[PDB]
Ligand binder design. Structure first.
Ligand code: HEM
Ligand code: HEM
Ligand SMILES: Cc1cc(N)nc(CCc2cncc(CCc3cc(C)cc(N)n3)c2)c1
Ligand SMILES: Cc1cc(N)nc(CCc2cncc(CCc3cc(C)cc(N)n3)c2)c1
Ligand SMILES: Cc1cc(N)nc(CCc2cncc(CCc3cc(C)cc(N)n3)c2)c1
Ligand SMILES: Cc1cc(N)nc(CCc2cncc(CCc3cc(C)cc(N)n3)c2)c1
Ligand SMILES: OC[C@@H](O)[C@@H](O)[C@H](O)[C@H](O)CO
Ligand SMILES: [Cl-]
Ligand SMILES: [Cl-]
Ligand SMILES: [Zn+2]
Ligand SMILES: [Zn+2]
Ligand SMILES: [Zn+2]
Lengths: 411, 407
């Protein structure tokens, strides 16, 4: 079967065949689309087909499909699964697997970069202290004094589900949030629950607006342990505006390194429950989402006040005007400090070139429009009028529930 | 099977049961989501009529009543005999309002029950259609105090006698390919404009020429009519702060009126059913003015603002976009022509959606269309999960008639 997608701006039509390789389900049916829903211990039996599907893909990618080496590897994995109920990936397979999980990540606008991913193999890690060292090293490598490099660190795979490695933080670097007795929040409201957990575990909170959270790390299914990332490894950018000299006095800053630490990496049916990965920011992630969501730093009003915009009616578009200036300040600030950042026009233009290339060379590029279109100025970016098809390819990154909900406390 | 929708901003969770009444297909499967794709007999007719009449009688608290049964009986007899049936005026009005209520792509549905329905099923000729449409335009326009309206022409019979408005909207601007290679006017309307000239329209050849209506009655070849110029309310676009903005020579029309969709009620198909409301400002200032394939005015505005256009990261496009949208709203408000900004409209839609969940068990909604084309995440619909599904009565896309009509 062939599926067509049209671009309503250019009239360019593309043909998707890659969707035939999709396995997992979307949440949608013939009767209902769940495209805007955010969230719509394997046996041997189910494991070997998943392993074989992966190894076939890997050997095809290296132009060794059906070779003795391919056949020998299938046999080797078969025997390992029948004997030990699981198997280990070769380092080459692990690298290929992590790169493809990114390539397949339908919500990621940054995928033009997918083949440039540094993979740190942490499968020899056994303790939380060991995890801490690996993570510090990832942060230092990825930060590279502001010349950001994409990276992923991969800890040991799931075994029986009672020995999982987990990073309890949602991102490696993120700011604390503190709910006050008067119902206001100091710092980042997104992180109040996790901050309370850290405090309960023994973290001495500075209780300021931009306190870098400690790492809370679980190895081999043990209770998690707290570690502070060395402050000298955490690159941050004070936010200022190129024309408005008062912008700096809002006291805003953000960290340079976006590093997702709460997702599960699936490769050939194996599950890597701790696999922190990082790239660099698109400006709107900070300037729109983190600063301007009502449940985040929520700075729109203050900014608009200082610009002396007419705030008596929404039709003056004061919110829109303030939002653009905030986003200008974020890009200006990162660029001035020589910290890698991409604006939403550049990122979406590059994504469309990536997507078209993937259609030609791969037969498709699964993409989630809801997440791919930036959260401001949508229609003036080239992804808005691009039709997309969303489907699930493996290897993949998957959502997992926060570990405080599932963890069995040992004491 | 019962479904939850969460708002990620307010944590409020709503439960949808209405989707279980959904009938038509979405285009998605368990394997693939097509949520961002724009276009994803006597035997057949009675179940559809019954489904509709059942919902109608339930709405007036008379389900299972003698009047309910009698009407079902009457409609059955009429279908068995004539291969179709006619709606009562009450049923026609109910069906039209519910087609709007069910329109998953419409952010304006808080207004759904306040729709003026003009029954034009007695219309027989294209000149008759012209008169009805002029009256609709005048009523809806109401000297700038716009009122929602729909005008419903005769239903489809054998499909060889369709009523159709060939225009995509009742009021829209012509587009003309230039010897230059450039396009003058609205590039969206180049093909339809050519058809109009081919059918004998004397084109003025300007940037904002209101297109004539091409009306098709009873399956006949369409005929040309000009809307009286004095019935077409337009707004010149100026800016409250930038004196030079007026010098761009921009204007737009006050009345947004869709004329190319098919209204389905109780299995009956109304192929000509122009309907109109009032604008949300981004429709003009973002879509019509700034789409690359439309009037595409971003560069000119940015230049007049003297922004740094050397690099995308100055956000010059975003700055000019906001200013264009400020000018659209200011202009309509100053001339006392109804318009709603995207903050106000989306706030209203959220309130509407909560009402619909509580009173009706759900509200089908297409997030891709509901979220405004600028400043998405600062509006309350962005963080609102929505379920998209198809309920009838409905408005449906139908192919442009020149691809279909046999002359
Ligand atoms: C190199 C620069 C990168 C940029 C500019 C970028 C950009 C983004 C953005 C803007 C989002 C959506 C966030 C939002 O809508 O608020 C996203 C999501 C995501 N990206 Fe990337 N990305 C990059 C690198 C990476 C890397 C290295 C990986 C993995 C190796 C990755 C995998 C993902 C995944 C799995 C998601 C969905 C996350 C979730 O569900 O929470 N991206 N990306
Ligand atoms: C009264 C004020 C109204 C407002 C502010 C409004 C708003 C809108 C907007 C902004 C869109 C999408 C346009 C875009 O995304 O570029 C839309 C679509 C739509 N609306 Fe409304 N609307 C109104 C009245 C109506 C009425 C009166 C009806 C029918 C009786 C209607 C039915 C529809 C339908 C069927 C669509 C999808 C059209 C298509 O597929 O092309 N709306 N509405
Ligand atoms: C409920 C829920 C589900 C889900 N799949 N993801 C989330 C978190 C969404 C999220 C929020 N802030 C930040 C991110 C990171 C996106 C991101 C990731 C990377 C690697 C680089 C980059 N520039 N940006 C993701 C929440
Ligand atoms: C666990 C959790 C709870 C909560 N209340 N909110 C969140 C964050 C939800 C959230 C808010 N803004 C942005 C995002 C990023 C994902 C995202 C979501 C949507 C709808 C569009 C888009 N472009 N990107 C996520 C997470
Ligand atoms: C290929 C295609 C499919 C489809 N379903 N609709 C379209 C037209 C989209 C479209 C473009 N401009 C304008 C509209 C009208 C939207 C609209 C309608 C009404 C009644 C009021 C209001 N404020 N706005 C719709 C095109
Ligand atoms: C027949 C036809 C052909 C063509 N090439 N373009 C069009 C216009 C396409 C178009 C462009 N921008 C906007 C719309 C309105 C519908 C719309 C679409 C989306 C994706 C989001 C949103 N908020 N609203 C429609 C129509
Ligand atoms: O305070 C805890 C939250 O940060 C956490 O629940 C995140 O929202 C979650 O991990 C999703 O990324
Ligand atoms: Cl956001
Ligand atoms: Cl648009
Ligand atoms: Zn879907
Ligand atoms: Zn947000
Ligand atoms: Zn558009």
């Amino acid at each position: 079967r062939f599926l067509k997608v049209k671009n309503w701006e250019t009239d360019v039509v593309l043909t998707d065949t890659l969707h035939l390789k999709s396995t997992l389900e979307t949440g949608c049916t013939e009767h209902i689309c769940m495209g805007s829903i955010m969230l719509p211990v394997r046996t041997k039996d189910q494991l070997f087909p998943l392993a074989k599907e992966f190894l076939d893909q890997y050997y095809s990618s290296i132009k060794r499909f059906g070779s003795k080496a391919h056949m020998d590897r299938l046999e080797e994995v078969n025997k390992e699964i029948e004997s030990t109920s699981t198997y280990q990936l070769k380092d080459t397979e692990l690298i290929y697997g992590a790169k493809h999980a990114w390539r397949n990540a339908s919500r990621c606008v940054g995928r033009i970069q997918w083949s440039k991913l540094q993979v740190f193999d942490a499968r020899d890690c056994t303790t939380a202290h060991g995890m801490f060292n690996y993570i510090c090293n990832h942060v230092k490598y990825a930060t590279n004094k502001g010349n950001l490099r994409s990276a992923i660190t991969i800890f040991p795979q799931r075994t029986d589900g009672k020995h999982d490695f987990r990073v309890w933080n949602s991102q490696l670097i993120r700011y604390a949030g503190y709910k006050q007795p008067d119902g206001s929040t100091l710092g980042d409201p997104a992180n109040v629950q996790f901050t309370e957990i850290c405090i309960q575990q023994g973290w001495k909170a500075p209780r300021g607006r931009f306190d870098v959270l400690p790492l809370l790390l679980q190895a081999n299914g043990n209770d998690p342990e707290l570690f502070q990332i060395p402050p000298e490894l955490v690159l941050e950018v004070p936010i200022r505006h190129p024309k408005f000299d008062w912008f700096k006095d809002l006291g805003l800053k953000w960290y340079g390194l976006p590093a997702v630490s709460n997702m599960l990496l699936e490769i050939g049916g194996l599950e890597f429950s701790a696999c922190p990965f990082s790239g660099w920011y698109m400006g709107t992630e900070i300037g729109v989402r983190d600063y301007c969501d009502n449940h985040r730093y929520n700075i729109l009003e203050e900014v608009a006040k200082k610009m002396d915009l007419d705030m008596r009616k929404t039709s003056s578009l004061w919110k829109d005007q303030a939002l653009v200036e905030i986003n200008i300040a974020v890009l200006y600030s990162f660029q001035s400090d020589k910290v890698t950042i991409v604006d939403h026009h550049s990122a979406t233009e590059s994504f469309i070139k990536h997507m078209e290339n993937e259609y030609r060379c791969r037969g498709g590029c699964p993409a989630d429009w809801v997440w791919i279109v930036p959260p401001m100025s949508g229609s003036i970016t080239p992804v808005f009028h691009q039709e997309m098809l969303n489907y699930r390819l493996t290897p993949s990154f998957e959502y997992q529930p926060d570990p405080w909900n599932t963890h069995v406390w040992k004491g």
